[PDB]
From a paper:
In the first step, we de novo designed antigen-tailored trimers, featuring N termini geometrically matched to the C termini of the viral glycoproteins. This design approach yielded nanoparticles tailored to present 4, 8, or 20 copies of the viral glycoproteins in defined geometries.
The final resolutions of the reconstructed maps for the T33_dn10, O43_dn18, and I53_dn5 nanoparticles were 3.9, 4.5, and 5.3 Å, respectively. There is less evidence of flexibility in T33_dn10 and O43_dn18, in agreement with the higher final map resolution for these nanoparticles. Nanoparticle design models were relaxed into the corresponding EM maps by applying multiple rounds of Rosetta relaxed refinement and manual refinement in Coot to generate the final structures. Overall, the refined structures show excellent agreement with the corresponding Rosetta design models. The self-assembling cores of the antigen-fused T33_dn2, T33_dn10, and I53_dn5 nanoparticles were very similar to the NS-EM maps of the unmodified nanoparticles (at least to the resolution limits of NS-EM), demonstrating that fusion of the BG505 SOSIP trimer did not induce any major structural changes to the underlying nanoparticle scaffolds.
Numbering used by the authors:
A (entry chain A), C (entry chain A), D (entry chain A): 1 to 119
B (entry chain B): 1 to 277
E (entry chain B): 1 to 143
């Protein structure tokens, strides 16, 4: 099962902070299995960690289509939009993350900040 | 009558335990080494005196249930005194009062063990003698571990020899005390328990010594450690053989032999490693 | 040679303490090559480290059928039995580990303790 | 793409200092793709790090045939020859590394030392 | 049994003797009067305690040969403690610690003598009682 090994290599490298490696390994795992929502999410996270926000947004969105209840992905999607200055989108996604998980204090604070920057 | 004597024992035990705790607290909250030294000596002094008073009263208890309570009171006070000292005496950069702590722990363990054996010898029931054996073994193990731990908290090899000798002393006396009480058992089930108690304590004493001796290059501590290890094995084995000779069921003698052989191996292996160092 | 890569990923993750990853990678390596005694042994070790003693026992036993001279596996098999309270078995396996390696001080000590708990 | 995963596993293990693993993974990556100059180079480096200078020399030479501008490989090729006492070769390779990169102070110093040992 | 009790006594006696020697050495090599005062008191304290433990064990020895060994152990420890104190406590311009030394020596002698008599009273053989008498007389003379 090359797809699982690709996944495992990706996860190990990711956990160790070796994002360059993690990205290549996840691309392989996903090429073989496009429905791996977790790999899409972590692929997006590796880009996010590198400041590659455009990629982080695309991949977070795919992970969410596969799994709409991933509150953390909603939160980070909002964060990437926020970082790019897209406050209208940041608000929309922080609100979803909170509906799924009201305990996310960071989302509440970032939500309020996005509202300040908005218009 | 037994109720009165037992009550007097419980009273003395409670007073003594409270006082030890208070002495430790009084010194634990200080920054003066002398305050600590006094608490170390006062805890040991008090516990020793309290044990002796309990023994004197306990001798008037003919009933086994009551003697068992007296034994527990001694054992509980002795272990509390040891814990109080271990904590109270720890740290101090490991330069100050480690000698006092080792001597105090070993001395309390000796008094408590001999006192228990002194009362325990009057039980006529194997179940009660077995309880006394356990109490002795537990005190011996606690004293060994407290000494061992203080010795390995050391920043330099200052006083490790004291720790080595104290462990060998406690193990030797505790083994003999067990053998002494155990000599009055008549059933193989109990003789077997006494044998394991000896073997285990001997093994623990050997391991504690081995580990201390094996922690750093130390040729003169190696010489002491090796003799202590061989000495412990000799005493443990002879005690086992004396008890084993009274077993007539065969299967139990085979077990006693396995136990002896294990002790011999532990001593030899620990020694060879220490010799190579 | 996917089986070797699975093995290597397993060993790297294992060495790094990432037992979750190591287990999945070893399962793949073994699925492809059931005679890899070393992988069976390390698979058992990863479970042992996680407190998963039932699995550690099964896998240690397989590693030993493939390699009866693995003193360490005999020792750890004895340890897993010991942890579960099976003192009769712990004794049997500590003795074998010692026959293969008399220097195992821990096995001697655990052997004596198992004898104390026995009956 | 097993060859890429083999490469990635090799690189991760290498980076982490697990040269034993890195070597086996690189051998797999190269078996599948003999033109991977970077893998040849890192394969040679793992041997170099282990004191396995004969292997380090062979693999560095292959990496260089594939990529003659790798100044670092020229430098390390010179170092392996130097370590074996082959000063004539060490001189030749330090000079090439310097032609490609004049800033390599270590090559200049080692070059002079090789000249001292020479004849 | 007697072998075990006797062995425990010999062990305690050897430990006690070593500790006395060490305390004396530790203070003998010092220039601090307080170090000496502590050694004087610790030697006496230790020897006293050791004697009492020996007596307690010795009471379980019905045999005369063994009681004689217990008596010797007490007498030997007591005389060693006295010698250690005498040397340790000497000099000091004769102004410092002479009172401690006198009291310590006399107190050890009293404990040791009474302890010997306590065990000695259980001998039934005139030869053994005579040995106990000698032990008492020798301790008294040394003190």
């Amino acid at each position: 099962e090359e797809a699982e090994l690709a996944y495992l290599l990706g996860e190990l490298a990711y956990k160790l902070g070796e994002y360059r490696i993690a990205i290549r390994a996840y691309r392989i795992a996903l090429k073989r299995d496009p429905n791996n929502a977790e790999a899409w999410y972590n692929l997006g996270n590796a880009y996010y960690k590198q400041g590659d926000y455009d990629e982080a947004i695309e991949y977070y969105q795919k992970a969410l289509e596969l799994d709409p209840n991933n509150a953390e992905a909603w939160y980070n999607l909002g964060n990437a939009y926020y970082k790019q200055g897209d406050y209208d989108e940041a608000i929309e996604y922080y609100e979803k993350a909170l509906e799924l998980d009201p305990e996310n204090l960071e989302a509440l604070q970032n939500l309020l900040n996005a509202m300040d920057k908005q218009g | 009558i037994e109720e009165v004597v037992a009550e007097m024992i419980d009273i003395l035990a409670e007073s003594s335990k409270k006082s030890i705790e208070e002495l430790a607290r009084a010194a634990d909250n200080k920054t003066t080494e002398k305050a600590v030294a006094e608490a170390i000596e006062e805890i040991a002094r008090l516990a020793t005196a309290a044990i002796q008073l309990i023994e004197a009263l306990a001798k008037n208890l003919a009933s086994e249930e009551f003697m068992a309570r007296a034994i527990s009171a001694i054992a509980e006070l002795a272990k509390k005194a040891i814990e109080a000292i271990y904590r109270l005496a720890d740290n101090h950069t490991t330069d100050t009062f480690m000698a006092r702590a080792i001597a105090a722990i070993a001395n309390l363990a000796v008094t408590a063990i001999l006192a228990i054996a002194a009362l325990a010898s009057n039980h006529t029931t194997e179940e009660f003698m077995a309880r006394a054996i356990s109490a002795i073994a537990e005190l011996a193990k606690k004293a060994i571990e407290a000494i061992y731990r203080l010795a390995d908290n050391h920043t330099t090899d200052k006083f490790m020899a004291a720790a080595i000798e104290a462990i060998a002393l406690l193990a030797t006396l505790a083994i003999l005390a067990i053998a002494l009480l155990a000599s009055n058992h008549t059933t193989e089930k109990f003789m077997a328990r006494a044998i394991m108690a000896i073997a285990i304590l001997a093994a623990k004493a050997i391991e504690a010594i081995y580990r201390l001796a094996d922690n750093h290059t130390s040729p003169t501590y190696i010489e002491k450690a090796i003799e202590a290890i061989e000495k412990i094995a000799r005493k443990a084995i002879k005690a086992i053989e004396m008890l084993a000779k009274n077993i007539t069921t065969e299967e139990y003698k085979e077990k006693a032999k396995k136990i002896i052989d294990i002790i011999r191996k532990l001593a030899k292996m620990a020694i060879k490693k220490l010799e190579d160092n």
